[PDB]
Amino acid sequence: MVETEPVQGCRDFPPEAMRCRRHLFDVFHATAKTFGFEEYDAPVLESEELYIRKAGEEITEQMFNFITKGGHRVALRPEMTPSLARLLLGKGRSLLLPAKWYSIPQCWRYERRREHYQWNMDIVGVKSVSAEVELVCAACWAMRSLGLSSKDVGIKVNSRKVLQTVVEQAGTSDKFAPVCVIVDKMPREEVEAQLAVVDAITTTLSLKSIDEIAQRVGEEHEAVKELRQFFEQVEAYGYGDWVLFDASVVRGLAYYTGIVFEGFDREGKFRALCGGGRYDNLLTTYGSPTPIPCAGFGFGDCVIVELLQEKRLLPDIPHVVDDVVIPFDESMRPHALAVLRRLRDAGRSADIILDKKKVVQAFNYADRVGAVRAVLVAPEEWERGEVQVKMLRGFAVPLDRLV
Amino acid sequence: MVETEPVQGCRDFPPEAMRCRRHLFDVFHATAKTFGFEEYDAPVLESEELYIRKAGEEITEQMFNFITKGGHRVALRPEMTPSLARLLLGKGRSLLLPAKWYSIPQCWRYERRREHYQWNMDIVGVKSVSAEVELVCAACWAMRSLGLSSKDVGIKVNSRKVLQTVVEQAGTSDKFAPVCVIVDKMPREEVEAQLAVVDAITTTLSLKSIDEIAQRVGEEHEAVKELRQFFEQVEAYGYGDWVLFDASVVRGLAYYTGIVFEGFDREGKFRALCGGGRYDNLLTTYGSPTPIPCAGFGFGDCVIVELLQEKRLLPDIPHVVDDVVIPFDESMRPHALAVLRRLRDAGRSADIILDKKKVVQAFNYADRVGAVRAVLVAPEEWERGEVQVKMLRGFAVPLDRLV
Ligand SMILES: N[C@@H](Cc1c[nH]c[nH+]1)C(=O)O
Ligand SMILES: N[C@@H](Cc1c[nH]c[nH+]1)C(=O)O
Ligand SMILES: OCc1cccc(Br)n1
Numbered sequence: 001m002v003e004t005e006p007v008q009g010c011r012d013f014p015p016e017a018m019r020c021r022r023h024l025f026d027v028f029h030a031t032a033k034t035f036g037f038e039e040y041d042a043p044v045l046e047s048e049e050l051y052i053r054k055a056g057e058e059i060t061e062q063m064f065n066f067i068t069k070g071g072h073r074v075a076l077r078p079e080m081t082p083s084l085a086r087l088l089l090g091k092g093r094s095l096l097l098p099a100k101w102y103s104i105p106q107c108w109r110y111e112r113r114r115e116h117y118q119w120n121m122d123i124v125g126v127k128s129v130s131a132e133v134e135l136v137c138a139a140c141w142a143m144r145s146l147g148l149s150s151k152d153v154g155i156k157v158n159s160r161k162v163l164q165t166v167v168e169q170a171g172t173s174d175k176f177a178p179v180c181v182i183v184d185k186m187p188r189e190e191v192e193a194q195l196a197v198v199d200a201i202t203t204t205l206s207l208k209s210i211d212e213i214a215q216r217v218g219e220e221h222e223a224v225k226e227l228r229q230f231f232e233q234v235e236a237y238g239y240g241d242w243v244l245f246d247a248s249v250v251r252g253l254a255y256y257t258g259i260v261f262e263g264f265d266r267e268g269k270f271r272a273l274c275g276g277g278r279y280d281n282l283l284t285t286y287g288s289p290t291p292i293p294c295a296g297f298g299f300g301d302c303v304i305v306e307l308l309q310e311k312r313l314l315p316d317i318p319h320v321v322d323d324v325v326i327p328f329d330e331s332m333r334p335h336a337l338a339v340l341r342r343l344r345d346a347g348r349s350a351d352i353i354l355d356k357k358k359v360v361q362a363f364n365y366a367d368r369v370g371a372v373r374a375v376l377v378a379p380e381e382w383e384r385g386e387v388q389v390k391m392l393r394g395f396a397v398p399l400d401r402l403v
Numbered sequence: 404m405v406e407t408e409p410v411q412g413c414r415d416f417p418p419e420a421m422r423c424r425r426h427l428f429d430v431f432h433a434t435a436k437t438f439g440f441e442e443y444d445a446p447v448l449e450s451e452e453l454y455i456r457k458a459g460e461e462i463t464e465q466m467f468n469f470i471t472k473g474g475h476r477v478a479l480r481p482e483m484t485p486s487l488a489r490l491l492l493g494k495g496r497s498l499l500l501p502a503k504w505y506s507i508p509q510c511w512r513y514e515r516r517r518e519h520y521q522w523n524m525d526i527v528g529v530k531s532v533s534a535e536v537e538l539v540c541a542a543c544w545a546m547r548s549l550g551l552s553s554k555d556v557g558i559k560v561n562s563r564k565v566l567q568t569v570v571e572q573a574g575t576s577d578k579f580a581p582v583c584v585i586v587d588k589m590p591r592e593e594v595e596a597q598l599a600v601v602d603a604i605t606t607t608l609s610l611k612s613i614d615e616i617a618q619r620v621g622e623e624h625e626a627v628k629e630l631r632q633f634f635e636q637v638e639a640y641g642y643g644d645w646v647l648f649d650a651s652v653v654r655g656l657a658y659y660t661g662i663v664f665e666g667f668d669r670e671g672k673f674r675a676l677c678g679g680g681r682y683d684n685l686l687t688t689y690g691s692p693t694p695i696p697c698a699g700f701g702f703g704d705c706v707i708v709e710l711l712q713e714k715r716l717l718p719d720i721p722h723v724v725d726d727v728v729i730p731f732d733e734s735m736r737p738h739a740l741a742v743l744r745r746l747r748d749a750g751r752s753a754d755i756i757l758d759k760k761k762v763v764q765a766f767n768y769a770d771r772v773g774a775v776r777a778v779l780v781a782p783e784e785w786e787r788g789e790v791q792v793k794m795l796r797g798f799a800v801p802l803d804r805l806v
């Protein structure tokens with residue numbers, strides 16, 4: 001027998017599991033539409049070059065790469081943001097701004113799971129914190145659409161500019177991104193050893209509010225005015241109970257320059273539900289002649305499902321279909337087919353019993369596939385221009401009155 | 404600057420191109436729902452073993468394979484059917500039958516395009532030709548939903564059992580599948596040379612009707628009764644002008660045992676639009692203790708788009724959004740945000756102008772993103788509990804009357 005299990009660290013999605021995934025994705029799609037984002041996509045396969053950032057990122061360290069037969073260094077994408085930037089840079093001057101683009105790519109890694117799907121939402125060409133406001137609200141919106149509340153989850157919000165200022169007011173301005181990557185890992189003894197290759201860092205990470213950080217850098221330091229505006233806008237949109245300040249949040253990615261944020265469950269049981277931030281320099285580093293402000297987030301398909309399961313928000317939903325058409329016997333098949341065509345022509349989902357079987361087993365089959373209605377096509381009714389209809393969740397009906 | 408082009412033989416889908424793809428996929432999905440098929444998925448990455456069929460298939464010859472860091476022979480899937488069978492075999496006795504499963508996987512190759520998406524539709528556990536009838540009708544349905552008619556396209560239909568009988572009545576019963584693979588290629592001189600490593604084959608390929616093939620094997624040879632039933636059922640479903648007999652159609656895949664079929668444009672300008680057939684032995688060869696009848700097709704995303712472009716059936720459709728909310732200035736942002744929340748709460752798609760800009764440039768922006776309506780939020784109206792609304796495809800309105 002063949003190996004029936006999927007390849008290492010990858011998931012199968014038979015119909016039952018696929019209905020769950022599709023329930024999650026319907027939300028990602030519907031939230032994007034609500035928020036005016038436009039869908040895009042790009043090859044899962046990208047040049048390895050794309051991801052050579054040299055900051056010790058976990059995401060790049062764990063890159064699922066290989067060499068083609070032609071000798072080209074390639075990778076299954078570990079994230080989407082670099083692909084987005086390539087696309088943006090490819091368009092350059094022709095792309096109208098601002099742009100709001102989303103996608104739900106499968107992303108990969110090698111080392112546990114080797115794949116996941118990740119909802120990506122990004123705003124391009126918006127300088128102001130309104131971009132981050134909308135992104136954080138979109139993530140809250142999706143979580144709320146899935147049945148969660150602000151009692152279940154929150155979004156922690158910070159700015160890297162603060163640490164930047166503390167890095168700046170202290171000793172280069174060359175390695176702010178590596179430091180973030182290390183500080184993101186916060187085993188204190190281990191983290192400090194990595195930073196050797198500091199006290200103001202730990203202190204400012206532990207500062208508990210905007211007022212306390214305003215004391216450290218001024219009531220108008222770049223980062224203070226943005227956060228107050230951010231919290232003020234989220235407040236005004238009505239999702240104020242969903243967001244809060246947390247100075248320990250920097251994220252693991254090199255390219256964030258400004259506001260960063262992270263979704264979490266309020267019980268402390270799970271990893272981040274989603275993660276994002278402003279990355280105003282990425283496209284400059286890809287060789288863009290003009291700086292392109294950007295901001296966005298990734299929202300994985302696994303952590304959220306665990307949370308939804310824990311909260312009893314992922315009930316199995318069975319397959320449904322409107323009609324199951326049942327030939328009384330094989331002589332009625334042509335006529336049953338004509339009825340099938342009408343039902344489908346009217347926008348109904350409909351099966352016809354494909355195999356040879358007895359009526360009562362056809363009815364049982366109808367029940368098992370979650371049919372709302374069974375339509376029996378029998379000789380005596382057919383000559384009266386009728387079928388027998390029966391609701392499952394039988395009285396004779398004219399063919400025209402079925403739809 | 405970074406390489407802005409995608410990796411060799413792969414396609415980018417910026418919003419414009421993605422709208423086209425999504426138009427095609429909406430059809431694939433909606434047809435599957437109409438026909439009662441259930442969605443499933445599986446990893447793009449599969450064990451190379453899965454595809455070792457040793458029949459000289461083009462699809463396996465051109466397999467995008469590699470070795471992992473752990474030394475495991477793997478491949479980006481060249482087709483989906485083997486993945487389906489793995490899943491089916493994994494379930495075995497627990498899977499209720501019949502089952503109707505669909506998916507729209509990206510599939511890959513190495514050699515031109517290295518990737519395409521392919522709608523897959525398969526019926527499992529149905530012995531009779533009704534399976535093939537429904538599959539062929541589903542493909543016609545999708546094409547018709549895309550604007551095509553039976554004047555534009557058809558489906559050629561055959562059975563491999565005929566050639567099987569001619570192979571059987573002639574000299575082993577071990578290499579029927581390799582012969583199909585060669586005969587599928589029909590450069591006559593080249594094809595005959597391959598078959599050396601025959602006249603009844605060419606003759607029967609050139610037979611022009613069911614009556615002529617019935618003369619060669621009997622009015623009830625397995626293949627004759629099935630085809631008459633097939634054409635009779637498709638006729639009864641009302642798609643008789645879409646289908647026809649063609650004895651030269653065998654398809655390139657080793658595993659087809661019965662009825663095979665192929666979609667084509669009636670002008671002779673394009674390759675096959677879709678391709679499928681019955682494959683009643685595949686799961687036996689994977690080690691299933693019980694024979695599992697199966698039938699299905701693949702329907703690519705490229706040929707169909709070319710055809711639709713040629714027929715002027717793929718007009719660009721611009722982005723749309725219901726509302727664009729416009730702060731009169733920054734002081735109105737909080738209030739504009741509250742309005743944004745209401746609109747979205749009511750199921751509308753809505754943007755808010757994120758950047759600082761003048762009203763008339765906001766209105767222009769609204770027009771460019773395809774907004775149905777612009778909602779101006781200005782101080783004088785706001786204190787009257789109102790905004791200014793203006794249709795694009797402005798009169799004052801109470802906040803409650805916007806939805
Ligand atoms: N690529 C980021 C998410 C993101 C999208 N846009 C900005 N950030 C991640 O994987 O965490
Ligand atoms: N795998 C086939 C299509 C198919 C699906 N089911 C049966 N056949 C192909 O690539 O042509
Ligand atoms: O960002 C972590 C990550 C990247 C790719 C795949 C998986 Br699973 N996890």
Ligand SMILES: OCc1cccc(Br)n1
Binds near residue numbers: 482
């Ligand atoms: O069946 C031909 C095929 C397989 C995989 C990818 C592409 Br493009 N074409």
